[PDB]
Design a protein around this ligand. Sequence first.
Ligand SMILES: CC(C)(C)[C@@H]1NC(=O)O[C@@H]2CCC[C@H]2OC/C=C/C(F)(F)c2nc3ccccc3nc2O[C@@H]2C[C@@H](C(=O)N[C@]3(C(=O)NS(=O)(=O)C4(C)CC4)C[C@H]3C(F)F)N(C2)C1=O
Ligand SMILES: [Cl-]
Ligand SMILES: [Zn+2]
Length: 193
Amino acid sequence: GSVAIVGRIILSGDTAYAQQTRGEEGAQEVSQTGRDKNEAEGEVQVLSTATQTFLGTCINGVMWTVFHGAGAKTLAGPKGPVVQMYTNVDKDLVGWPTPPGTRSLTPCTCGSADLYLVTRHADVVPARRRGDTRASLLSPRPISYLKGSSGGPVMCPSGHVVGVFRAAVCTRGVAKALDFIPVENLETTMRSP
Ligand SMILES: CC(C)(C)[C@@H]1NC(=O)O[C@@H]2CCC[C@H]2OC/C=C/C(F)(F)c2nc3ccccc3nc2O[C@@H]2C[C@@H](C(=O)N[C@]3(C(=O)NS(=O)(=O)C4(C)CC4)C[C@H]3C(F)F)N(C2)C1=O
Ligand SMILES: [Cl-]
Ligand SMILES: [Zn+2]
């Protein structure tokens, strides 16, 4: 089974919109055959396997997502399934060559502490950065609000990408903070010998 693109999260600065591109049947077919003839576009994709769904974020020519969503699976593409370029279980990180037609977000170099997560439902969730990999939510959220958004982007006010959403700091079913793979750690992954 392959990972399939089933939609994209269109970013328009302050707001986002979730556009579905595959229904359940089409999604399953793309994952089964590993072949996807739709011309992809955008920077944030909605991804699905046979059993799960989550997000992927295009950065530095690679579409990144979480290992706990994609495993080591191939990505369905126009020429057939595409093997993962990066697979790091320790970081819960995987990457494929960015699908043709997509574009990459720019890594943030402005150091702003005011961040926002874009969820799979196109919700924008403000957060305040707390160290390298964490950001505290301005408003607590039920975990169901954030489920399915692993692999989505954490952004700065200028529309730069700061990190890739990995996990929620969550007790008693309420998320208080975000854990994300910082963009600098993606560059390290692309530099690791
Ligand atoms: C309690 C909780 C919120 C469920 C949990 N918090 C939590 O563990 O907090 C601690 C303390 C602060 C950071 C974190 O340190 C531990 C690191 C965990 C990890 F992430 F690195 C991780 N590495 C793995 C590597 C290999 C195999 C499996 C792995 N499994 C992992 O974590 C698991 C999964 C991850 C998850 O749910 N991610 C999200 C999501 O949407 N997934 S998903 O799309 O629906 C779906 C399941 C389809 C793919 C974004 C959060 C959303 F729900 F908000 N988890 C549990 C959590 O977030
Ligand atoms: Cl990391
Ligand atoms: Zn920035």
